[PDB]
Amino acid sequence: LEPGHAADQEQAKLIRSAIEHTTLKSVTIASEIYYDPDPRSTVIPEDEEIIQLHFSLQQSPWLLRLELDRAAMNDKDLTMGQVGERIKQTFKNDLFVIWSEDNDEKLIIRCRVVAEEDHMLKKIENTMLENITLRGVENIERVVMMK
Amino acid sequence: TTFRFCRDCNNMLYPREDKENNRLLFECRTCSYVEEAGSPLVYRHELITNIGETAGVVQDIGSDPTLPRSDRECPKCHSRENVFFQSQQRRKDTSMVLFFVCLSCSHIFTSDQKNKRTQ
Amino acid sequence: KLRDQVLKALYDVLAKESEHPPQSILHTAKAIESEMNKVNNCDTNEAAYKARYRIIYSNVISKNNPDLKHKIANGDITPEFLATCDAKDLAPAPLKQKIEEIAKQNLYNAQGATIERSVTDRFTCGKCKEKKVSYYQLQTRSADHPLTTFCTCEACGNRWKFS
Numbered sequence A: 001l002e003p004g005h006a007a008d009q010e011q012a013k014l015i016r017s018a019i020e021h022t023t024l025k026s027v028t029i030a031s032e033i034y035y036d037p038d039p040r041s042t043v044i045p046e047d048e049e050i051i052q053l054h055f056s057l058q059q060s061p062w063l064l065r066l067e068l069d070r071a072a073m074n075d076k077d078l079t080m081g082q083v084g085e086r087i088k089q090t091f092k093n094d095l096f097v098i099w100s101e102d103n104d105e106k107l108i109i110r111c112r113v114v115a116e117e118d119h120m121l122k123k124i125e126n127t128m129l130e131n132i133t134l135r136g137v138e139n140i141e142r143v144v145m146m147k
Numbered sequence B: 001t002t003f004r005f006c007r008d009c010n011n012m013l014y015p016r017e018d019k020e021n022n023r024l025l026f027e028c029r030t031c032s033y034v035e036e037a038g039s040p041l042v043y044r045h046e047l048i049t050n051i052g053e054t055a056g057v058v059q060d061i062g063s064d065p066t067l068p069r070s071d072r073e074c075p076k077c078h079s080r081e082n083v084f085f086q087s088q089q090r091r092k093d094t095s096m097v098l099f100f101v102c103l104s105c106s107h108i109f110t111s112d113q114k115n116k117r118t119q
Numbered sequence C: 001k002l003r004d005q006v007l008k009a010l011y012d013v014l015a016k017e018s019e020h021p022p023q024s025i026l027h028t029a030k031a032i033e034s035e036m037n038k039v040n041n042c043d044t045n046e047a048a049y050k051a052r053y054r055i056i057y058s059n060v061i062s063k064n065n066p067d068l069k070h071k072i073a074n075g076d077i078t079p080e081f082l083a084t085c086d087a088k089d090l091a092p093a094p095l096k097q098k099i100e101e102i103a104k105q106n107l108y109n110a111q112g113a114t115i116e117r118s119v120t121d122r123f124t125c126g127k128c129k130e131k132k133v134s135y136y137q138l139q140t141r142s143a144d145h146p147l148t149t150f151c152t153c154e155a156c157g158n159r160w161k162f163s
């Protein structure tokens, strides 16, 4: 550590979370695929509260749900916005991406695509995993702190 | 995700789309069968999995000598004839919780004192 | 300009959940828009403004709904401080305590294996000459001739060997 901030416990777990190769695959719980046809009200009633916000303020019906774990998402200091802003700039402006906040019983990232579109929704199922970095240097899996 | 096969030609039912009405339909791709969806959830892929499971009790477990006998009173029938073993999910992390098979009614009580299961 | 988006959000939300507060609407909403407008940065942020306030006023429809007036305030002063932190920690219920209960569970994960080995007072050390030495039977050639015996000093680090 840097000469001064070397005996600070929390300081140590801040650098940790900046070196460890943290992939979208690390925090994900389940990756689901839904048939949600009307992109103005979710079929899932545990999501209703989400759309209200991302509308208050032409795509495709094949929804892609992702549940992130709160636990893992705070070992490596991240927030829903940071996670979502990262996916939305990988495929950029051609995958309709949304995400919940940090105060809901369950975190969720819902994204839709924009002639066999259920087969292109898996080309991209694999990229959202083994080819996307959140925060960390590649090849650096596991980072342990020691006194 | 529970997946259904059709009648007659008995095969894998693949989900296709109903454009004009906006709904989901499973269909057979060697026959001509098609049916409605009981749910909108088509595909699930679990990564981080919550698991903690017992064994494949044939009730004949009592009829295996190589299983140890402790002496707790079974919750229901109160018979101190137990046989026990650890979780059969032989994964590296899973814990040392003992499962007791009551040899009187085949009830399955545990040793746990942090959580609870009806499993 | 796009304060309409700011406008409807407050007014609408704080009065439409339940019709129970009337005309106090034109003071709760009105007051806490310039605070965000004075910070919005008509551009600058680019959405780091939106991100906060938008996502603030969505912490308002969730499971904290008993406390999801207020609003009715305890010093509604929280919003200027809803631009730094941004309070954030301040928005949940006791699910706060859960979040910080998870915090600890994560530190324990970061630290690594602790080398614990029973030390013997029947050993002389060169480095610190102390009586704190652990070893491990083995191994080279066991018995005839004899058998190696490798110690260690967990104080000093040195290693020697017998035979």
Ligand SMILES: [Zn+2]
Pocket: B006, B007, B008, B009, B010, B011, B028, B031, B032, B033
């Ligand atoms: Zn068929």
Ligand SMILES: [Zn+2]
Pocket: B074, B076, B077, B078, B079, B102, B103, B104, B105, B106, B107
């Ligand atoms: Zn019994």
Ligand SMILES: [Zn+2]
Pocket: C125, C126, C127, C128, C129, C130, C152, C153, C154, C155, C156, C157, C158
């Ligand atoms: Zn020594």
